[PDB]
DNA sequence: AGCTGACAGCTGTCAAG
DNA sequence: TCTTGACAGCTGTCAGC
């Protein structure tokens, strides 16, 4: 349900936008389609990533 | 924005809320029952109770 | 002239791998 | 077996009555 291929595609986007890790709705659409994820999965992933990757990198 | 809030909905939701003040958290079965009775979506029902908890229930307790 | 429905993102949490 | 995708409910906030 969560393709293992999705993770590195999503991380690539995240680590390339660390200063503003909030994809636009169009960016979410692209990421969803490219990863094989749903919009909900993409949204939840970035919520989790921001508190588990992005914030800890600043702390 | 093509959504609607049916006229009958407000008082049906209020009736449920004020009859369950000690635990204003409908079960999933109660939620779909309310959706049927009001003509609201499950999402609308969920959002309604989130708003009512902080705008009705909590303020009543603050004065309590 | 707010109320209030609505929604993007956050919090707290947990099953399952 | 500790990590992480997932989700019920919460926070912050806006826009049209």
Swiss-Prot record, chain B:
Looking at the record's lineage, which domain of life comes first?
A: Eukaryota
State the compartments where it is located. Answer: Nucleus; Cytoplasm, Perinuclear region
Region (Interaction with DNA) residue spans: 21-55
UniProt DNA-binding residue ranges: 3-60
Changing residue 54 to M does what? Impairs DNA binding and PBX1-dependent transcriptional activation. No effect on interaction with PBX1
Expression (tissue specificity): Expressed in various tissues. Expressed at high level in the lymphoid organs of hematopoietic tissues. Also expressed in some regions of the brain, such as the putamen.
Q: Which disease is it linked to?
A: Cleft palate, cardiac defects, and impaired intellectual development: An autosomal dominant disease characterized by multiple congenital malformations, mild-to-severe intellectual disability with poor speech, and delayed psychomotor development. Congenital malformations include heart defects, cleft lip/palate, distally-placed thumbs and toes, and cutaneous syndactyly between the second and third toes.
Report the function annotation for this chain: Involved in transcriptional regulation. Binds to HOX or PBX proteins to form dimers, or to a DNA-bound dimer of PBX and HOX proteins and thought to have a role in stabilization of the homeoprotein-DNA complex. Isoform 3 is required for the activity of a PDX1:PBX1b:MEIS2b complex in pancreatic acinar cells involved in the transcriptional activation of the ELA1 enhancer; the complex binds to the enhancer B element and cooperates with the transcription factor 1 complex (PTF1) bound to the enhancer A element; MEIS2 is not involved in complex DNA-binding.
Can you state the subunit structure given in the record? Monomer and homodimer. Heterodimer with HOXB13. Isoform 2 interacts with TLX1. Isoform 3 interacts with HOXA13 and PBX1 isoform PBX1b. Isoform 4 interacts with SP1, SP3 and KLF4. Isoform 4 and isoform 5 interact with PBX1 isoform PBX1a; the interaction partially relieves MEIS2 autoinhibition. Isoform 3 also known as MEIS2b is part of a PDX1:PBX1b:Meis2B complex; Meis2B is recruited by PBX1b and can be replaced by isoform 4 in a small fraction of complexes. Can form trimeric complexes including HOXB8 and PBX2 or PBX3.
The family annotation for this protein states: Belongs to the TALE/MEIS homeobox family.
- Its protein name is Homeobox protein Meis2
Which species does this protein come from? Homo sapiens (Human)
Q: Which portion of the entire protein is included?
A: 281 to 342 of 477
